[PDB]
Every structure is written in C-alpha cells, then in structure tokens.
Structure 1
C-alpha cells in the first residue's frame, strides 16, 4: 500500500518515499519525501481541487506560472504526479525543492538581527523584480510565502492568486478602499508590511475588517494629503477618506526604536499611502539600506513577460481540469 501522513494518502511511489508532514491549509497538505531517482529530499504537496472552479483556477495558475518562471529566489516545480487519464485524476502531487522553514514560522521563535533582515529583504525584492519584470502581480505576499534554507537563502512561493498586470493584513490600502486601477505597487506594500514584521515580530496593520485595518494604517501614516486624495479614481474611495478624522503621522522610529535608520527610510517608501508615489522594485533594490547586496548584474529579469490576462475566470471547472491535465503532461513519459 501507499504511504499515509496525518490520514492523507500520498500515492507517489515508487519514486518518492519516506513521506513526513510539513504543513497544511486550504490548498491541501505538504510533506517532505525522498526522491529515489535523483537521491535528494524534496517537498511534495497534495492538491485535490477538482470539485470547484476557484480551486482549479488557483491550481492552474500555480502550475503555469511556476513552470514558466526560473529564478533563484522563486520556488520551482521539479515534477508533477497525477493519474494517467483525466477521469482518474482526483489529486495532483507537485514536487518542489525542500527548504528548512518559512518566515512565518521563523518569526514565531526567533528575533532577527539587522544582518538577517537586510539579506531577507534583499532576496524578497530580488525575486519580486523578476516577478514584476514578467508583467505579473503576486498579490499575496506574506511571511508564510517566503521559504528559507539553512544559509538564509529565500524563495517566494504560492502563485495561486497571481495575475498578469492589466489573512488580509498584508493588503494595500487601495485594494481595501476599492480605489480601482491596481498596479505592481500592491506587492511593494506587502513587502513593506513584511519588513515591519521582521523588525518587531508582529504584524504592523492587523484589523477585524478593512475599516479597522484602514484606521490602523492611517493612525500610523497619518491622513492622506489632499493631493493624495485627488489621485484616487474612485469617488466613493475619496469620499470615504474625507469622512475620517484627521490623524498625524507617527514617526517610524517610535514604533521601531532599534531599527536601522536606513531600514526605516525604505520602510517609509514602501508603506507610502499613494500607490503612484510608492517606491518601485528596482528603486527599492538601489536603496542605501541594501547597499551590501545590491548588484544589478546579478538581479535578472524574465526572458518573456506575460502579455495577456490568462482568461480563466469564466472557464468551467471541468475545462480547467483538462487544462491542468495538459499542463502536467510534460512530466509524463513520451513514446
């Protein structure tokens, strides 16, 4: 019989054996395993998405994007196991490099030194430069999506919500206000939130719902200038902000009194309220805080950026399942 972990069968043998639990979520379950061909330990995740269209979209995006991307700071896909026919296919096993932990877990137990924060931040931005150069928005950057190895190498994961550019605590204010016209800047906001969390071991902008989160945001950043209000397309968003009481900016060094001054200048530029004024990834990399690492010769871009929206939103789940079957065929044998 097949190996089982926490009640889930992982039917990945004979090539992959010695299954051990790592974690789980709505997506399914991830385990470590041993690859008896390549003689290496790997991560394997079991996804079972075919009952719902949304799950199938997230699965197809993950697979398509990660097979197209190739970057040191982005997790790849090494192999995919699924059934030999569409009708038999209920589970999809995605095989990826094994890392040691993720930043969510790390921050639960460890206080990071500036040297660690600086290197992690560098790598996040270096991977994000590639993502953005592919004309893609990640849209769900957060500490659990940052995988780490023993020498502090970092890889971004989870492209299930990514889109071609046309927990809620890491979401940019423009999304919450429904300001319309979202850009790459949404991911920079998320990185700002991750940096603040590396500096303090807790989230900078928690909140019950968007109204609460926005009040916390503006309680720290202070009220948007009229000029920033005038840059909002959505009149409903502008009007909502004009309805709030005036708040002064809280200095960053109040909240993070032991943080590097350069780190706080970059934090301020990332956690800028107006998305048009928010620092872009290439300028972030060039910021003084990251001078120890910055090297444009070693910060590659995507060879062939995505041109067009993937257009998955109104495909039935059964058609998405066929597209998943087709995408996963490159890991099946040829004649």
Structure 2
C-alpha cells in the first residue's frame, strides 16, 4: 500500500498516493472532480478523477460500480484506459471514496475547434478514430451515450481518445444528444452515438455547433429544421395518436440538402454526414459500416480495427442493497491490475 497525502484544491479534498505530485485542477464536473497530476513512477502526466459521493444513494452506488466496471473493461487505443484505481481506505468499512487515473491528453476537441480550422484530412483522421473506438465499444454491447467535444481529447499527433461514458440509464450539453434520448423513446440503438458523431463531424468541418439549442424544445426545433419533419415510414412506428397529431400540426419541413448546408466540404464527408444524421435510428449507419466508407480510405484497415471482449453487464438488472453495491465496488478496486508498461517505455 502506498503512502497517501492530503491536499485541498478549489475547495475539494484530494487524498492520493505520493507518486502523484503537482496536482492542478483541470475541471469541476457532475461526473466528478478532475485534477491533472505528474506521476513520479512513470514520468507521465495523468488525469485523476475523484468520484463525487460514490455511495450516497442506491443510484449513486450502482453508478459508481457501473463506471468502474466499464472503465476496467476498456482496452483500446482510442478509448480511455485505466492506469490506476485507488482509495485511501484501509478496509471496506472505511471505504467511501474512489479515484480513477488515466493518461492526460494534450487537448479537448472544443479547444482544437477554437484553436484552428481543421483540414479535411484532419477531420477524416479524428472522425476515423472516434468510429474506431466506437466500433470497439459497441462490440461489447455498450452505448457510450455522451460523445461530445469535451469527452474527446487528442495528443500532439492528433491521436484521439474517447473519454467519460454516459452513466444515465432508464451541466450536461444537449447539443450532441440524439432526438430519441430527449423524447424518452426508451429502447435506444447504439446509433444514438452515431448521431453524436455526426454532430461532431459537422462542427469539425464548419467550426460551428450544428445544433446549439438554448433548451430542450429549441434543440429539437433546430434538429427538425435540418433533417425535416418525420417521414411516413417513421410515423408508422409511433404509437401515440396525440404525438402523431402534434407532428402533423407542426409546419411540414423538408429535409435540407446537406450538399448546400455543408457546401465546400468534401462530397464524401457530406455523403457520410447524410448517413449519420438520419432521424430514424434504424436507418443510421453503424460504426463498422462507417469505417468502410470511402471518406476513410486513407486510414481504414480492416485488420487493425479490433473488437472488445464480452462485457458482463448482468449487474444492470440487479436491485441490491447499498452495502452490496459498495462491497462489489471495493472488490473491483482491490482486483485492479495496471496495464504493462509500453515497449517504447523501456530501453535495451
């Protein structure tokens, strides 16, 4: 067991192994409190996330366990991977905080969009890597649920990682959200992530948020103006008469031509945007289909787009006591095994 030390940053107390040094706050979030740190043992800067009140309620406790299970499973070049998990607690009875450690990426997608207008080649590489990481996530039967520029980060080589997963089931931007998640459809496809990819791609191409809604209804207003009011084939899948009547009541809007909306963009990029930003989620392109799209010809390698090991999420169906959730989380903390040092990290 390492020795821990305590320290106050922006009004939150941080207790961490002495290996972590120079803690600097990166952000304060609904997800948790995040601080940049330097790891003396690896010589590498790290991002440390402290779980906010992990066991305050059954919902928070299950969510804590969900996040730890998720992140422990993720081993992919374009997905956040866990370098460390720890708690200052010496026993389960004392267990009340969880800290998660990952490599610190150089920049957020939002910072990159502000910093420069991306080249089409840069857009192809960044979106290719999101879809590559996404193929892996969906292969484990996981929906990320919260792809957005601040959950995407790159290094100096524009190598990209997908970060914090959406932990809601059954403060937080609605701009990249799929319309069905807002409308409470309740049987979400993995395609909701593809809708979020399409929103991000548009923004990388134009420099501007595609759908910057001011509130919930405005968000859907802006979406329908681009993709149009729902088609007959979609109206067939909606049971409520009142919901159908309201859509019929709305002034009919034709889907806008993407070629005009994204004019000056690569035509292949516009074609791919059309296949992502479809209202009907059954008709959105999948991550694996999108990686074979001609727009990614320069980067596509069918033999280097790996898939995930099976992910046991039978826990999602459990209703357990708060003490069981806390206890299962503690077991996962105890059993965590750090990944090995990279070859590039060692010498002769």
**If the length of structure 2 is used for normalisation, what is the TM-score?**
0.87
Checking the alignment, whether the CA contact within 8 Å between 2:145 and 2:166 is kept in structure 1 is: no
Deviations 1:75-109 (A, max 9, x none): 11111120112332332211111211111232233
Distance 2:214 2:62 in 1: 28
Could you tell which deviates more after superposition, 128-137 or 301-310? 301-310
- Map Cα deviations across residues 244-267 of structure 1 (whole Å, 9 max, x no partner): 211122222333222111111101
2:213 corresponds to 1:207:
yes
Task: Name the structure 1 match of 2:222.
Answer: 216
CA distance in 2, matches of 1:176, 1:21: 32
Give the equivalent residue in structure 2 for 1:32: 36
Deviation at 1:185, TM superposition (A): 1.3
- Indicate which of 130, 135, 148 corresponds to 1:129: 135
After superposition, the C-alpha distances for 1:100-157 in whole angstroms (9 at most, x for unaligned) are 1111232233321212111110000000000111011111111111121111111111
Unmatched 5+ residue regions in structure 1?
Answer: none
Aligned residue among 111, 120, 126 for 1:114: 120
Count of residue pairs brought into register by the alignment: 330
**2:148: which partner in 1?**
142
Deviates more, 1:247-256 or 1:120-129: 247-256
Looking at structure 1, the residues matched to 111 and 125 of structure 2 have their Cα atoms a distance apart, in angstroms, of: 17
2:71 is matched with which residue? Answer: 66
Q: How does 1:1-335 map to 2 (within 5 A)?
A: 2-49=6-53, 50-82=55-87, 83-161=89-167, 167-233=173-239, 235=241, 237-306=243-312, 308=314, 310-311=316-317, 314-331=319-336
Q: Is the 8 A contact 1:102 1:147 kept in 2?
A: yes
- Are the equivalent residues in 1 in contact too, given 2:110–2:150 (CA < 8 A)? yes
- CA distance in 2 between counterparts of 1:143 and 1:61 reads 23
CA distance in structure 2 between the aligned counterparts of 1:101 and 1:310, rounded to whole angstroms: 33
**Conservation of the 8 A alpha-carbon contact between 1:163 and 1:309:** no
Q: Are the equivalent residues in 2 in contact too, given 1:15–1:35 (CA < 8 A)? A: yes
| TM-score (normalizing by structure 1) | 0.90
Q: Kindly report the root-mean-square deviation, in angstroms, between the aligned alpha carbons of the 2 structures.
A: 2.4
